């Protein structure tokens, strides 16, 4: 998994690769590692895929209820405090390693959070097995006062480093841009640098190739009238 | 792995399956679990493929040297004991072997020795070795007679492997048959279990639990 967050002038950009693995086998070639906590608070998730989804939806649900109760747009620090206290309670057994980003009435924010409950602040962050490849790119090209276009470039380049050099990461780059005073734009499959080449042969079988013992109609419909 | 060998009026029948698995996945369906030691002697493979294959080929070299020196065919007793004494030197090191050394000589008649990697050497009339042995034994014990014909004995060995191939997950692929006579062994072909099962089901009326 290769996930990054990069701060820029008017907001924060977040990005991830799209490979999910069971040992050495690619279970999903287009996994979604970017999660929406609220409309303008998104996070990137590494570790146990079920946990990153579950923990973002739980906190995202409670955030929504809190937003309705307080008549205020949600804050990143709220999502952050709720995530860390939850993960700390479970002593790391909930394997969720998140990069939490967003915009709110206070400004634009970028945090990382470890499965044990520790949080970190930064202008650029990476996480997962491709984090070292990504962080190398971030450490070589990051600067203060990046523009939106530069940050999307830097973020996706850092993910690419992971795609190519880390066996845990692969396929496509997903991006989400959260700019102040603007709708968060979720760029699903922003880059697609791993389309499989046309096969040498078609493996479409002639009809009646498979041997068949029995056939029957399945009754999916309900009990009928008359 | 299901290997059997039994003694009867017409010599020895040897029948084996063909399957090799790594963990849950089937590495090979085309494994030769009969080692042709020489033209008169057969060995079965169970436990370690390498250990059986290597040391029973080596055995064939020792048998050849014996008959060059003594100007006489080696006895099944002597051949089996060369192998058993060898593996017994390696006891503890971790060889894995369960084999039937099978031969037909004038002095002895048809003879089977179960040889085994913890040093066991047993003469006997019927032997089954492998994960599917218990299934093969059932069919053998209920149908075996000394006065079987060569045709019926061949079928019995084939059918006993089929019984194991069906039930035992780690046995199958195909059945290899051998008939050992005093003038040497005779190969009686490779029989795909998939095709054999349906053939046997229909012709025999067995396996009514299975839909075909």
């Amino acid at each position: 998994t290769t996930i990054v967050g990069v701060k820029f002038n008017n907001g924060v950009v977040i990005a991830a690769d799209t490979r999910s693995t069971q040992g050495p086998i690619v279970a999903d070639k287009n996994c979604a590692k970017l999660h929406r906590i609220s409309p303008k608070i998104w996070c990137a998730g590494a570790g146990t895929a079920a946990d990153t989804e579950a923990v973002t939806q739980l906190i995202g649900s409670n955030i929504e209820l809190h937003s309705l109760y307080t008549s205020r747009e949600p804050r990143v620090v709220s999502a952050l405090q709720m995530l860390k206290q939850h993960l700390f309670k479970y002593q790391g057994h909930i394997g969720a390693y998140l990069i939490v980003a967003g915009v709110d009435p206070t400004g634009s924010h970028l945090f990382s959070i470890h499965a044990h409950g520790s949080t970190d602040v930064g202008y650029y962050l990476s996480l997962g097995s491709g984090s070292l490849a990504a962080m190398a790119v971030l450490e070589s090209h990051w600067k203060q006062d990046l523009t939106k276009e530069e940050a999307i470039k830097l973020a996706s380049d850092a993910i690419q480093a992971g795609i190519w050099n880390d066996l845990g990461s692969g396929s496509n780059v997903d991006v989400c841009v959260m700019e102040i005073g603007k709708d968060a734009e979720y760029l699903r499959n922003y880059l697609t640098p791993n389309v499989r080449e046309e096969k040498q042969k078609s493996y479409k079988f002639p009809r009646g190739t498979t041997a068949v013992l029995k056939e029957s109609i399945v009754n999916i419909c309900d009990i009928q009238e008359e | 792995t299901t290997t059997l060998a039994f003694r009867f009026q017409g010599g020895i029948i040897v029948a084996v399956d063909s399957r090799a698995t790594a963990g849950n996945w089937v590495a090979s369906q085309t494994v030769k679990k009969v080692i042709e030691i020489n033209p008169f002697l057969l060995g079965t493979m169970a436990g370690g493929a390498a250990d059986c294959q290597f040391w029973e080929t080596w055995l064939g070299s020792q048998c050849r040297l014996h008959e060059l020196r003594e100007k006489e065919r080696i006895s099944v007793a002597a051949a089996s004991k060369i192998l058993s004494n060898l593996v017994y030197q390696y006891k503890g090191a971790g060889l894995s072997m369960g084999t039937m050394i099978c031969g037909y000589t004038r002095k002895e008649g048809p003879t089977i020795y179960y040889v085994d990697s913890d040093g066991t050497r047993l003469k006997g009339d019927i032997f089954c070795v492998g994960s599917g042995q218990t299934f093969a034994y059932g069919v053998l014990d209920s149908n075996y007679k000394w006065d079987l014909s060569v045709e019926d004995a061949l079928y019995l060995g084939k059918r006993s492997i089929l019984a194991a191939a069906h039930r035992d997950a780690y046995s199958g692929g195909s059945v290899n048959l051998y008939h050992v006579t005093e003038d040497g062994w005779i190969y009686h072909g490779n029989h795909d279990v998939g095709e054999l099962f349906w053939k046997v089901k229909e012709e025999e009326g067995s396996f009514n639990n299975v839909i075909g």
């Binding site: 490979r19 693995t21 050495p24 086998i25 690619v26 070639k29 097995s129 795609i163 190519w164 050099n165 880390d166 066996l167 845990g168 990461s169 692969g170 396929s171 791993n194 499989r196 080449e197 096969k199 040498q200 042969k201 493996y203 079988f205 002639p206 009809r207 009646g208 190739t209 498979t210 041997a211 068949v212 | 996945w25 590495a27 090979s28 085309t30 494994v31 030769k32 370690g48 493929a49 390498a50 250990d51 294959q53 290597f54 090191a93 971790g94």
Partner: protein, 222 residues
């Protein structure tokens, strides 16, 4: 504790044609989640029209290939430059492997060439020297992904002739070198999609009576 073994990944594939043989293998070399090299040759020409690959732990794989190559050289010295036949090579490799029965070469070995009648030959070895002549054999990481496909598309397993409904099998017609190479390429393209240790490049060594020829193809680098 010191672990003398390691896993360098990779996948190899030997297919025996009617009058040719191919031994293919990806060119990626890895440890854990890192790539060591995108092009590290794994299949070798060993002389006497024999090709070999020892896939798994690359240090043992290189040692074994090196020793076998040396065995070809000394066979020529000891036996009046006699050509080492593929079956003889196979038996020799068994003894090399079984020589280390109690501290094994951690490799799955395949060799390919032509038998003494000019027909295609592949031999497959386990780590301790058990071996068999085979028509078709994938070795290494993505072997479980490739073999079921080859059962279906080379040997036509589970394929019956339309209209008969399971009564007549699809006949086992002989494949050309061009047809085999398509199945090799598609095996590795598919394996690359679904196995993280397979990729970068595919090097195929084709053996005929005319000698050993090489072909190289790109694979996805992610």
């Amino acid at each position: 504790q010191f672990n003398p073994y390691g896993d360098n990944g990779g996948t190899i594939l030997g297919i025996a044609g009617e009058d040719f043989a191919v031994l293919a293998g990806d060119t990626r070399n890895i440890t854990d989640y890192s790539i060591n090299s995108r092009y590290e040759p794994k299949v070798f020409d060993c002389g006497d029209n024999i090709v070999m690959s020892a896939n798994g732990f690359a240090a043992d794989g290189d040692a074994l290939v090196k020793r076998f190559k040396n065995s070809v050289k000394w066979y020529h010295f000891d036996h009046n430059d006699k050509k080492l036949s593929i079956n003889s090579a196979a038996r020799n490799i068994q003894h090399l492997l079984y020589g280390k029965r109690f501290f094994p070469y951690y490799v799955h070995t395949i060799i390919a060439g032509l038998d003494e009648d000019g027909k295609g030959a592949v031999y497959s070895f386990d780590p301790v020297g058990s071996y068999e002549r085979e028509q078709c054999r994938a070795g290494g990481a993505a072997a479980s992904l490739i073999m079921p496909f080859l059962d279906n598309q080379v040997n036509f397993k589970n394929q019956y002739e339309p209209g008969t409904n399971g009564k007549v099998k699809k006949p086992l017609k002989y494949l050309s070198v061009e047809e085999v190479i398509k199945l090799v390429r598609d095996s590795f393209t598919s394996a690359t999609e679904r196995h993280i240790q397979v990729g970068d490049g595919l090097e195929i060594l084709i053996v005929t009576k005319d000698g050993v020829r090489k072909e190289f193809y790109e694979l996805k680098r992610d």
